[PDB]
C-alpha cells in the first residue's frame, strides 16, 4: 500500500515523466508549490507543512526518482538529469504560471539546474540544509576535534564496489537511525514508528541503491553546476539552516549569496539538519510567510 | 597457531608487558630494529623486509595491542598509552643500547609518544604513510574532486554506537579488500590469497573492535601530542610516502619537518599507501640503506 499516511484532503498519485513513473502527494488550490525531499526521507517529511500551505496554494510533494514510490531515473542521477523530471512534473500542473519551489538536502542538488535554466518558471525559491554542489564542498573536513564530521558520508556513499549498499543491507534501520540522530539537535521527534517508516522505504533494494547513486553523481553535478552558475538566480530566494548540531549554520546563506541577487536567510538556533521535523513550527512559519508575501 | 607464515629462521613468540600478552616475530643478530605495522594488517606486512634486515640487525615485528595475535591493551588505545607497551617490549630485547624504529600508518600514532619521551633510546627512525596525530588532521577534506578522500574513514571508524563494527561484522573480507585497494596504486599485489590472510585476522571480534578503538582515541592522541611536540626529535629520521593513488605525497615530509631536526623524505612514484607490498624493492632498499648508516652486524 502507501508507504506513508496521506493527510486528509490530499491524494497519492503518479505521473509518467519521460518514461519514469513518479509518485507524489498533492492537495490544495491556487498557485503551485513543489516541495522536494532529501536523503533518508520521502515526500512524507513535508506532511506537517503541506496542510498549512494547502490553505493558499496547490501543493505537490514528489518522491525523488528511485526513492519512496518513484521509479528510478532512466537517464541518470546527476543534478541536471534529475531536475528534468522534477521540472516537467511541475509544469504538468502549472503550465501557465510560475511555481514556487522548496527543497531540502539533496532536493537542492536535484532542482538547482532546472531553476537556473528555467528562471521564468520559478516564482519564489526556498532552499534548506545542504550545499548547492560546487567547489565549496571540497573544503568540508573529513574529521573534527569532537569526532565524526558532518559530510564524511559524501565519500562513504560515493564509494564504488557498492560499499554503502553492501555494508548497510540487513542493517538499514540501524544505519538510518544513527545517520538521522548524528545530524539532529532534537532527536525526540524521531519516534520508533517514524524511523520504521523511513527505514522500510529506503531499504527497498532499488531505493537503497538510488540513495547512494545521487552521491556517486555528485562530482558530475559539481562540474555541471560550474557552467550553469555563470547565470545568477533572479527570483526571490530564502535559505534556512539549523544553528544546532547537524546544522549548516551561516554556510547556507553565505553560499546562496554567490548564486542569488535577492536572498534572505535564517539560522534556527536549537535545530539541526531535519528542519521540517526537528523544528516544524518555526520552519513552517518562515516558509509560509515568505511564499505568501 | 600462526595467523601468518613465519619467514625461515624467525621465531613467533609472546612477551607479557604490563599485563598484556604481545605477539611478535623475531630474527637476526645485531642491534635491534622494531617494525610496527598499521591498520588492516599485522606484523606480516614486514615479512619481505625482515630477512634482509636480519642480516645486519636483530629484527622484531610485534602485533599492535588487540590486532594480530596480541591481546588488547589494558590502559587504553591513545598513542601515549599504547606506546608504553611497545617501548617496554623493545627495551626487554635492547635494555642497554638504543634501537631503531620503523612504523607504518597507525604504527606512527602508537610510537611517536615513546620516541619523543625516550629520545636516547631511539637511534634512527623511519615513518611512512600516516600523519602524526595533530591539528593538521582536521584540515583533510571529507570529499575530493578527483580520486577519493584519504581519511574520511577517520570519522567512520570514530563514530559512536559501534557504527563501524556493526556494519562491517560479517563483511570483514569484503570491506578490507575495498579499503586496501582503494588506498593502493599497485592493486595487483593484493591477491585474494593475501587478502584472505589479513581479513581472517582482523575479523576476530576483539580485533575488529580494537582496530576502531585506535580511531576513537585519535582526538585524545592529538591532545597528548600538542604537549609532547614542544620538544623536537633529535635523532636521524626518514619519511616515506607513496606518490600514487592513496599516497600521502609531500605531506609526510612536510609535517615531519615540524617534528624533527634531522629528516630526509622520499615520495615513491606509482606507489600508494601499502609501500612494503606495492613497492617492496625501492622501499626495502631505502629502509635498509638508511638504517645501515648506523652501526650494524
Ligand atoms: C543530506 C546531504 O547529504 C544530508 C546533509 C548532512 C550534512 C550537514 C548536516
Ligand atoms: C591508516 C590510517 O588510518 C590507513 C589510512 C590511509 C590514509 C592516509 C595514510
XYZ file of C-alpha atoms and ligand atoms in Angstrom:
608
model
C 0.000 0.000 0.000
C 1.112 3.550 0.732
C 4.481 3.727 2.446
C 3.379 6.762 4.490
C -0.059 8.013 5.596
C -1.563 10.677 3.324
C -3.008 13.793 5.028
C -6.725 14.456 4.826
C -7.597 16.413 1.696
C -4.543 15.131 -0.209
C -4.212 12.424 -2.845
C -1.385 9.999 -3.534
C -0.948 9.703 -7.299
C 1.510 9.012 -10.115
C 2.542 10.658 -13.380
C 4.732 9.359 -16.186
C 7.542 11.808 -16.952
C 9.918 10.801 -19.761
C 9.115 7.127 -19.230
C 9.616 7.273 -15.438
C 6.632 6.770 -13.122
C 6.886 9.439 -10.405
C 4.922 9.242 -7.160
C 3.649 12.404 -5.486
C 1.148 13.640 -2.904
C -0.973 16.630 -3.918
C -3.616 18.856 -2.373
C -4.918 22.379 -2.091
C -5.905 25.119 -4.506
C -4.131 28.113 -6.003
C -0.655 28.649 -7.457
C 1.640 25.647 -7.307
C 4.289 24.982 -4.664
C 6.543 21.941 -5.164
C 8.271 20.514 -2.058
C 11.302 18.276 -2.729
C 12.688 15.981 -0.007
C 16.233 14.756 0.604
C 18.325 11.754 1.589
C 16.919 9.228 4.047
C 13.392 10.553 3.550
C 10.475 10.853 1.128
C 7.608 13.257 0.432
C 6.449 12.491 3.981
C 8.940 14.852 5.600
C 6.638 17.628 4.337
C 3.422 16.179 5.755
C 3.112 18.768 8.538
C 3.758 21.753 6.249
C 1.508 20.545 3.419
C -1.931 21.111 5.067
C -0.999 24.651 6.146
C 0.388 25.560 2.724
C -2.679 23.996 1.075
C -4.824 26.793 2.515
C -3.324 29.225 -0.029
C -1.540 27.067 -2.651
C -1.767 23.897 -4.650
C 0.926 21.725 -3.053
C 2.764 18.810 -4.667
C 5.416 16.723 -2.889
C 7.101 14.170 -5.172
C 9.302 11.266 -4.280
C 12.734 11.704 -5.874
C 13.433 9.180 -8.656
C 14.218 5.781 -7.180
C 13.163 6.823 -3.661
C 9.825 6.425 -1.933
C 7.386 5.109 -4.525
C 9.034 6.735 -7.588
C 10.728 4.672 -10.281
C 14.485 5.128 -10.747
C 15.576 7.639 -13.380
C 16.170 6.234 -16.835
C 18.807 8.852 -17.715
C 20.938 9.185 -14.585
C 21.272 10.600 -11.096
C 23.208 13.809 -11.778
C 21.545 17.074 -10.854
C 20.850 18.123 -14.436
C 19.321 14.753 -15.314
C 17.081 14.505 -12.259
C 15.985 18.140 -12.467
C 14.393 17.430 -15.860
C 11.944 15.000 -14.243
C 11.012 17.435 -11.480
C 10.676 20.413 -13.827
C 8.442 18.511 -16.251
C 6.352 17.157 -13.364
C 5.747 20.675 -12.032
C 4.891 22.011 -15.493
C 2.192 19.351 -15.897
C 0.369 21.036 -13.021
C 1.411 24.687 -13.534
C 1.773 25.157 -17.320
C 0.610 28.801 -17.429
C 2.088 30.307 -14.222
C 5.467 30.205 -12.493
C 5.561 27.929 -9.458
C 7.274 28.028 -6.072
C 9.969 25.556 -5.074
C 11.001 24.392 -1.605
C 13.830 21.887 -1.315
C 15.725 20.112 1.486
C 19.155 18.408 1.358
C 19.711 16.608 -1.985
C 16.409 18.078 -3.154
C 18.597 21.143 -3.736
C 21.018 19.147 -5.902
C 18.127 17.763 -7.928
C 16.436 21.107 -8.546
C 19.104 23.813 -8.894
C 19.789 23.107 -12.609
C 16.158 23.473 -13.630
C 15.772 26.646 -11.543
C 18.738 28.322 -13.222
C 17.783 27.133 -16.718
C 14.041 27.966 -16.426
C 14.020 31.073 -14.234
C 10.763 32.420 -15.693
C 9.085 29.244 -14.384
C 10.174 29.785 -10.743
C 8.299 32.427 -8.789
C 9.991 32.045 -5.382
C 12.665 29.662 -4.102
C 13.357 28.178 -0.640
C 16.476 26.066 -0.055
C 17.419 24.416 3.241
C 20.192 22.284 4.737
C 22.663 21.301 2.012
C 25.247 22.957 -0.230
C 24.480 23.541 -3.848
C 27.064 21.214 -5.468
C 30.149 23.327 -6.157
C 33.810 23.538 -5.187
C 32.883 24.657 -1.660
C 32.046 21.057 -0.782
C 35.727 20.141 -1.145
C 36.564 22.291 1.910
C 34.426 20.419 4.453
C 36.668 18.442 6.834
C 36.904 14.668 7.000
C 37.266 14.660 10.799
C 36.777 17.100 13.668
C 38.170 17.591 17.158
C 34.763 16.465 18.511
C 34.504 13.268 16.442
C 32.779 12.484 13.173
C 32.292 15.356 10.730
C 29.093 16.496 9.034
C 29.691 15.234 5.498
C 32.064 12.267 5.570
C 29.068 10.365 4.210
C 29.725 12.094 0.868
C 32.717 9.777 0.448
C 31.092 6.705 2.049
C 28.069 6.947 -0.241
C 30.078 7.798 -3.392
C 32.494 4.882 -2.944
C 32.434 2.117 -5.546
C 32.072 -1.652 -5.054
C 28.554 -0.814 -3.765
C 30.328 -0.170 -0.455
C 27.363 1.532 1.226
C 24.672 -0.884 -0.006
C 26.801 -3.872 0.948
C 27.581 -2.672 4.486
C 24.104 -1.274 5.196
C 21.967 -4.141 3.824
C 20.412 -6.016 6.744
C 21.215 -3.016 8.976
C 19.136 -0.356 7.229
C 17.149 0.714 10.306
C 20.275 0.784 12.473
C 22.196 2.925 9.993
C 19.380 5.369 9.262
C 18.711 5.922 12.960
C 22.393 6.660 13.538
C 22.550 8.932 10.497
C 19.449 10.889 11.477
C 20.478 11.322 15.096
C 24.105 12.248 14.297
C 22.724 15.077 12.142
C 19.983 16.130 14.588
C 19.734 18.501 17.515
C 16.258 17.309 18.520
C 16.140 13.514 18.310
C 12.911 13.119 20.305
C 10.871 13.951 17.186
C 12.017 10.674 15.578
C 9.692 8.113 17.122
C 10.047 4.369 16.671
C 7.186 4.436 14.160
C 8.637 7.282 12.088
C 12.078 5.657 11.953
C 10.415 2.358 10.989
C 8.560 4.040 8.115
C 11.622 5.778 6.676
C 13.814 2.700 7.106
C 11.365 0.376 5.336
C 11.153 2.771 2.385
C 14.841 3.274 1.704
C 15.585 -0.393 2.460
C 13.888 -1.415 -0.795
C 16.952 -2.615 -2.758
C 16.405 -0.219 -5.671
C 15.876 2.666 -3.224
C 18.943 1.845 -1.143
C 20.998 1.917 -4.344
C 19.208 5.010 -5.646
C 20.044 6.801 -2.378
C 23.757 6.424 -2.970
C 23.718 6.937 -6.749
C 22.869 10.598 -6.035
C 26.254 10.804 -4.276
C 28.060 8.795 -6.955
C 26.919 11.555 -9.338
C 27.915 14.415 -7.007
C 31.205 15.322 -8.698
C 29.426 15.259 -12.062
C 26.810 17.572 -10.560
C 29.580 19.936 -9.378
C 31.046 20.014 -12.886
C 27.602 20.640 -14.400
C 26.925 23.459 -11.951
C 30.240 25.174 -12.696
C 28.836 26.066 -16.124
C 25.247 26.681 -15.002
C 26.293 29.118 -12.258
C 27.504 31.671 -14.832
C 23.850 32.809 -14.746
C 22.766 34.209 -11.384
C 19.320 33.499 -9.965
C 16.979 36.485 -10.154
C 13.858 35.310 -8.315
C 13.202 35.987 -4.606
C 15.014 33.342 -2.561
C 15.105 32.314 1.097
C 17.584 29.987 2.768
C 17.034 28.151 6.055
C 19.629 26.328 8.120
C 19.889 24.807 11.558
C 22.095 26.525 14.107
C 22.473 23.489 16.366
C 24.267 20.177 15.993
C 23.835 18.928 12.432
C 23.082 22.405 11.109
C 24.769 24.170 8.206
C 24.853 27.441 10.153
C 25.827 30.524 8.169
C 27.105 28.455 5.223
C 23.671 28.116 3.595
C 23.030 31.848 3.220
C 26.655 32.728 2.511
C 26.822 30.249 -0.363
C 23.443 31.355 -1.720
C 24.658 34.968 -1.809
C 27.047 33.899 -4.581
C 24.117 32.449 -6.581
C 21.150 34.770 -5.990
C 20.692 38.524 -6.299
C 17.639 38.634 -3.983
C 18.144 36.352 -0.963
C 17.199 36.384 2.709
C 18.411 33.803 5.185
C 17.650 32.467 8.627
C 19.594 30.274 11.016
C 17.404 28.498 13.572
C 19.101 28.071 16.967
C 18.455 24.730 18.610
C 17.751 22.938 15.307
C 19.858 20.509 13.311
C 19.552 19.100 9.794
C 15.990 17.759 9.811
C 14.210 21.106 9.937
C 10.647 20.062 8.908
C 10.619 17.554 11.790
C 13.055 18.921 14.394
C 11.717 22.460 14.154
C 8.414 22.117 12.321
C 6.544 25.129 13.669
C 9.155 27.888 13.093
C 10.268 26.387 9.773
C 6.660 26.164 8.594
C 6.027 29.767 9.632
C 9.073 31.110 7.801
C 8.235 29.206 4.608
C 4.537 30.144 4.656
C 5.249 33.829 5.260
C 7.966 34.009 2.603
C 5.739 32.383 -0.025
C 2.632 34.360 0.980
C 4.169 37.849 0.851
C 48.735 -21.456 15.876
C 50.129 -18.854 13.470
C 47.893 -16.483 11.529
C 50.714 -15.757 9.028
C 53.723 -17.806 7.857
C 56.921 -17.027 9.740
C 59.965 -16.410 7.496
C 62.625 -19.099 7.631
C 64.901 -18.614 10.620
C 62.475 -16.369 12.513
C 60.568 -17.265 15.669
C 56.994 -16.403 16.613
C 56.710 -15.723 20.345
C 54.940 -13.720 23.053
C 56.013 -11.375 25.832
C 53.825 -10.167 28.678
C 54.159 -6.387 29.052
C 52.227 -4.578 31.805
C 49.749 -7.452 31.948
C 49.208 -7.625 28.167
C 50.430 -10.567 26.092
C 52.067 -9.158 22.941
C 52.801 -11.318 19.894
C 55.941 -10.700 17.868
C 58.131 -12.287 15.214
C 61.881 -12.056 15.798
C 65.042 -12.972 13.934
C 68.608 -11.999 13.190
C 71.552 -10.692 15.180
C 72.979 -7.284 15.984
C 71.409 -4.011 17.134
C 67.632 -4.049 17.493
C 65.194 -2.756 14.885
C 61.483 -2.802 15.753
C 58.986 -2.696 12.858
C 55.434 -1.560 13.746
C 52.507 -2.263 11.381
C 49.293 -0.319 10.770
C 45.536 -0.618 10.306
C 44.201 -3.571 8.353
C 47.431 -5.509 8.740
C 49.763 -7.219 11.221
C 53.487 -7.911 11.599
C 53.213 -9.800 8.299
C 53.359 -6.636 6.201
C 57.090 -6.602 7.072
C 57.754 -10.230 6.150
C 59.680 -9.459 2.924
C 61.826 -6.742 4.516
C 62.583 -8.753 7.672
C 65.031 -11.344 6.207
C 67.215 -8.681 4.606
C 67.299 -6.573 7.773
C 68.094 -9.656 9.848
C 71.433 -9.981 8.034
C 72.590 -6.861 9.922
C 70.160 -6.407 12.834
C 68.080 -8.208 15.382
C 64.585 -7.647 13.971
C 61.350 -7.674 15.992
C 57.903 -7.146 14.467
C 55.103 -7.001 17.077
C 51.362 -7.126 16.583
C 49.750 -3.938 17.895
C 47.595 -4.445 21.026
C 44.305 -6.111 20.066
C 45.471 -6.804 16.495
C 47.057 -9.915 15.049
C 47.803 -12.268 17.943
C 48.324 -9.538 20.597
C 45.933 -9.047 23.490
C 44.049 -5.725 23.699
C 45.627 -3.014 25.844
C 44.541 -2.752 29.446
C 45.085 1.015 29.744
C 43.659 2.423 26.518
C 44.200 2.971 22.814
C 45.617 6.515 22.788
C 49.073 6.899 21.320
C 50.734 7.609 24.660
C 49.108 4.565 26.300
C 49.959 2.105 23.521
C 53.480 3.467 23.102
C 54.305 2.326 26.651
C 53.738 -1.302 25.657
C 55.888 -1.023 22.542
C 58.697 0.861 24.285
C 58.867 -1.675 27.121
C 58.742 -4.589 24.652
C 61.680 -3.192 22.683
C 63.698 -2.429 25.802
C 63.325 -6.032 27.001
C 65.394 -7.023 23.948
C 67.645 -3.929 23.933
C 67.983 -2.865 27.585
C 71.486 -1.334 27.310
C 71.524 0.182 23.797
C 69.284 2.375 21.640
C 67.215 0.649 18.974
C 65.872 1.596 15.552
C 62.193 2.089 14.767
C 60.211 1.683 11.534
C 56.489 2.365 11.603
C 53.621 2.422 9.108
C 50.187 4.095 9.383
C 48.820 3.913 12.958
C 52.155 2.407 13.954
C 53.237 6.058 13.858
C 50.439 7.075 16.221
C 51.391 4.272 18.592
C 55.132 5.028 18.703
C 55.586 8.796 18.455
C 54.996 9.414 22.213
C 57.628 6.903 23.301
C 60.136 8.280 20.772
C 59.718 11.846 21.993
C 59.731 10.860 25.694
C 62.696 8.447 25.374
C 64.833 10.064 22.680
C 68.085 8.485 23.896
C 66.535 5.028 23.337
C 65.876 5.637 19.604
C 68.925 5.572 17.344
C 67.227 6.086 13.958
C 63.576 6.458 12.945
C 61.599 5.675 9.772
C 57.961 6.776 9.464
C 55.711 6.057 6.480
C 52.167 6.772 5.291
C 50.176 8.497 8.029
C 50.024 11.868 9.777
C 51.353 12.151 13.273
C 48.165 12.998 15.220
C 47.937 16.784 15.443
C 45.741 19.675 14.302
C 46.683 19.046 10.653
C 44.334 16.055 10.520
C 41.372 18.414 10.902
C 42.272 20.053 7.569
C 41.968 16.946 5.392
C 38.844 17.071 3.179
C 35.781 14.881 3.536
C 35.312 14.659 -0.236
C 37.528 15.372 -3.237
C 37.039 16.489 -6.840
C 39.444 13.847 -8.162
C 40.307 10.484 -6.668
C 38.962 9.818 -3.190
C 39.284 11.448 0.221
C 42.187 9.780 2.016
C 40.899 9.912 5.577
C 37.102 10.011 5.584
C 37.392 6.659 7.381
C 38.649 8.574 10.444
C 35.051 9.709 11.039
C 33.525 6.335 10.094
C 35.774 4.432 12.497
C 35.459 7.014 15.294
C 31.649 7.232 15.101
C 29.578 6.323 18.170
C 27.127 3.411 18.520
C 29.827 0.976 17.293
C 28.765 2.109 13.831
C 31.781 0.615 12.022
C 31.828 -2.779 13.788
C 28.078 -3.161 13.443
C 28.186 -2.541 9.697
C 31.412 -4.450 8.995
C 30.890 -7.542 11.179
C 30.270 -10.493 8.869
C 31.560 -8.483 5.875
C 35.177 -8.087 7.012
C 36.682 -9.742 3.941
C 34.636 -7.587 1.556
C 35.395 -4.404 3.476
C 39.134 -4.980 3.770
C 39.597 -5.683 0.059
C 37.780 -2.441 -0.748
C 39.706 -0.459 1.862
C 43.115 -1.799 0.845
C 42.633 -1.496 -2.910
C 41.027 1.972 -2.671
C 44.199 3.143 -0.890
C 46.579 1.465 -3.377
C 48.273 2.362 -6.653
C 49.605 -1.131 -7.447
C 46.457 -3.039 -6.505
C 47.587 -6.267 -8.194
C 49.818 -7.285 -5.267
C 46.701 -7.783 -3.120
C 45.846 -11.283 -4.247
C 42.714 -12.962 -2.955
C 45.028 -15.294 -1.017
C 46.811 -12.414 0.766
C 43.537 -10.593 1.470
C 42.146 -13.817 2.955
C 45.045 -13.924 5.444
C 44.646 -10.330 6.592
C 40.853 -10.498 6.730
C 40.801 -13.647 8.865
C 42.970 -11.894 11.456
C 41.073 -8.653 11.817
C 37.697 -10.436 11.769
C 38.374 -11.792 15.261
C 35.726 -9.768 17.140
C 38.205 -8.281 19.602
C 40.499 -7.334 16.695
C 37.725 -5.694 14.689
C 36.828 -3.636 17.751
C 40.460 -2.913 18.639
C 41.024 -1.617 15.088
C 38.412 1.090 15.534
C 39.326 1.984 19.117
C 42.589 3.443 17.759
C 40.449 5.929 15.819
C 38.107 6.524 18.755
C 41.233 7.615 20.672
C 42.622 9.777 17.852
C 41.435 13.089 19.309
C 42.957 12.173 22.669
C 46.209 11.382 20.847
C 46.102 14.813 19.183
C 45.687 16.432 22.604
C 48.576 14.376 24.010
C 50.851 15.273 21.098
C 50.123 19.004 21.418
C 52.117 18.867 24.661
C 54.771 16.361 23.584
C 55.658 18.181 20.352
C 57.132 21.088 22.331
C 60.372 19.064 22.130
C 61.604 18.266 18.632
C 63.073 14.894 17.704
C 66.877 14.947 17.560
C 67.765 11.548 16.010
C 68.158 10.871 12.277
C 64.718 10.414 10.726
C 63.470 9.305 7.305
C 59.926 9.588 5.952
C 58.448 7.587 3.090
C 55.196 8.274 1.263
C 53.541 6.990 -1.865
C 53.098 9.371 -4.771
C 50.361 7.319 -6.402
C 46.713 6.730 -5.554
C 46.367 6.513 -1.780
C 49.750 8.083 -1.073
C 50.357 10.940 1.349
C 52.648 12.649 -1.168
C 54.601 15.613 0.152
C 52.531 15.850 3.360
C 54.577 13.179 5.142
C 57.893 15.038 4.915
C 56.364 18.495 5.319
C 54.695 17.586 8.623
C 57.797 15.732 9.848
C 59.930 18.864 9.373
C 57.891 20.447 12.172
C 58.759 17.476 14.422
C 62.363 16.576 13.574
C 65.648 18.445 13.259
C 67.275 15.797 11.016
C 64.859 14.453 8.387
C 65.076 13.273 4.798
C 61.963 12.348 2.861
C 61.061 10.300 -0.182
C 57.916 10.082 -2.294
C 57.745 6.819 -4.239
C 56.068 7.184 -7.655
C 53.454 4.656 -8.644
C 53.012 3.547 -5.019
C 50.048 4.114 -2.726
C 49.543 3.522 0.975
C 50.836 -0.057 1.221
C 54.509 0.575 0.495
C 56.029 -2.743 1.725
C 53.758 -4.700 -0.606
C 53.097 -2.308 -3.513
C 56.713 -1.207 -3.869
C 58.843 -3.737 -1.988
C 62.079 -3.285 -3.937
C 62.529 0.514 -3.612
C 61.019 0.714 -0.120
C 63.154 -2.107 1.284
C 66.245 -0.531 -0.293
C 65.556 2.889 1.218
C 64.981 1.419 4.687
C 67.973 -0.942 4.686
C 70.315 1.776 3.416
C 69.097 4.356 5.935
C 69.404 2.036 8.937
C 72.791 0.775 7.746
C 74.287 4.254 8.106
C 74.446 3.422 11.817
C 76.382 0.606 13.449
C 75.141 -2.826 12.387
C 76.051 -6.512 12.326
C 21.913 15.423 3.081
C 23.035 15.624 2.123
O 23.960 14.607 2.063
C 22.451 15.368 4.467
C 23.279 16.549 4.812
C 24.115 16.492 6.032
C 25.260 17.436 6.028
C 25.199 18.501 7.055
C 24.360 18.162 8.233
C 45.957 4.128 8.076
C 45.401 5.335 8.759
O 44.077 5.257 9.131
C 45.440 3.960 6.686
C 44.691 5.100 6.098
C 45.245 5.802 4.911
C 45.036 7.275 4.873
C 46.273 8.092 4.772
C 47.559 7.396 5.066
